[PDB]
């Protein structure tokens, strides 16, 4: 299938080029938050080592797609009244992402109150013949998604569903999931090359880096903080 | 005037910390468009940058109207027939001034060059703008300090020979700082920890470029790390 051949080509690409995935999500409402600029970042990253990119939003994805040759992991972020889930919560979101050219669809796979169950989101992804990525927050969530046959298990939500976000990335989750057979994408707070290397060392198949590459305001804050005395 | 700008900039550095962001994407990059350079400068200014460094007239004109912080302007050349690249001509000074630069930076190295350093500085002063000396050695920085140049950068240290050191030139920061220079540490300050070190070494401010505005460079650093 096109999905299996894409996975094979991505596995080859990670093996030959290194497992770097770049999330092209500027701060929303930022000067940088324009679809053409999102497109430019994605092209720049893909020219310089990114084996794939993550893109949020239909307008961004439609602008990016025609000018990008690597796989795109697509998400939609919503804010819901009754549920804390934001990442690709609806079947309609899956449909739109598929129609706009996502190669892989990522979605919140946490054990939290939500409008559509995980199995239904996954079925809808499979209906479009696309690969699925589970954005997880705990080992148990990751294992549960692995059991369903989901191709990519992300640590994306670890630290974003509990009481506080740790400073360091969740390397223990990477370690435990990868050694349980998951194809792990380490994601969340991998904001130095050393940390990204650390994820690979702990079993991650690839690492997604976001802020350190595509959020100028955040990078500036890091430096600004360092220089004040 | 120029003194009002320096005082304002002194205040902003004290209150926010001395971070200057150089907005220079890889030439030819998808990011290398004046509207994108302008967006990067605005983004940086909203998030801690007390000033930005912009290269090129097209970029500067596009950036200027939408930016409230000072702009350090340069024009980088390849074809002067000398090793000097940073703002080598009097007409470059004229064009940067006309385009809205607040501070003009220029190569202040003791190398062959079409225009002498005194003439460039005089040209900067004629436009009533502040000057910044991009220097490669302590001796170059002291010389420019004695001319009364407001900002002394370590910008060119490691960039005049075939070998570029991995670590930033922190010794040069200390030595110039001890000589009474208002030192702008510039060159290879690509981690927050290194920027902090420059301040501890006596830097007034640190200019960061690649780690903030060169996506291809940042990607390479991460790609090299994950590769194996
Ligand atoms: Cl030239």
Swiss-Prot record, chain B:
PANTHER family in the record, alphabetically? N-ACETYLMANNOSAMINE-6-PHOSPHATE 2-EPIMERASE-RELATED (PTHR36204:SF1)
Instruction: Quote the gene name from the UniProt entry.
Output: nanE
- Family annotation (InterPro entries): Aldolase_TIM, NanE, RibuloseP-bd_barrel
Q: Name one GO molecular function term.
A: N-acylglucosamine-6-phosphate 2-epimerase activity
- UniProt name for this protein: Putative N-acetylmannosamine-6-phosphate 2-epimerase
State which pathway it belongs to: Amino-sugar metabolism; N-acetylneuraminate degradation; D-fructose 6-phosphate from N-acetylneuraminate: step 3/5
Q: Which UniProt keywords apply?
A: Carbohydrate metabolism, Isomerase
Q: Which domain of life is it from?
A: Bacteria
């Amino acid at each position: 299938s096109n999905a299996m051949s894409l996975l094979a080509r991505l596995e080859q690409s990670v093996h030959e080029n290194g497992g770097l995935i770049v999330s092209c999500q500027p701060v929303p409402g930022s000067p940088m938050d324009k679809p053409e600029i999102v497109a430019a970042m994605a092209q720049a990253a893909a020219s310089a080592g990114a084996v794939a990119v993550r893109i949020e939003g239909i307008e961004n994805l439609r602008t990016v797609r025609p000018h990008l040759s690597v796989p795109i992991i697509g998400i939609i972020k919503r804010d819901l009244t009754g549920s804390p889930v934001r990442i690709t919560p609806y079947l309609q979101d899956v449909d739109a992402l598929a129609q706009a050219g996502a190669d892989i669809i990522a979605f919140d796979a946490s054990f939290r109150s939500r409008p559509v169950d995980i199995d239904s989101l996954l079925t809808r992804i499979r209906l479009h013949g696309l690969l699925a990525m589970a954005d997880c927050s705990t080992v148990n969530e990751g294992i549960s998604c692995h059991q369903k046959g989901i191709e990519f298990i992300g640590t994306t939500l670890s630290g974003y569903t509990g009481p506080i976000t740790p400073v360091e990335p969740d390397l223990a989750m990477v370690t435990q999931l990868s050694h349980a057979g998951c194809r792990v994408i380490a994601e969340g707070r991998y904001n130095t090359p050393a940390l990204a290397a650390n994820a690979i060392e702990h079993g991650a198949w690839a690492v997604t880096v976001g802020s350190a590459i595509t959020r100028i305001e955040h990078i500036c804050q890091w430096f600004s903080h360092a220089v004040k005395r």
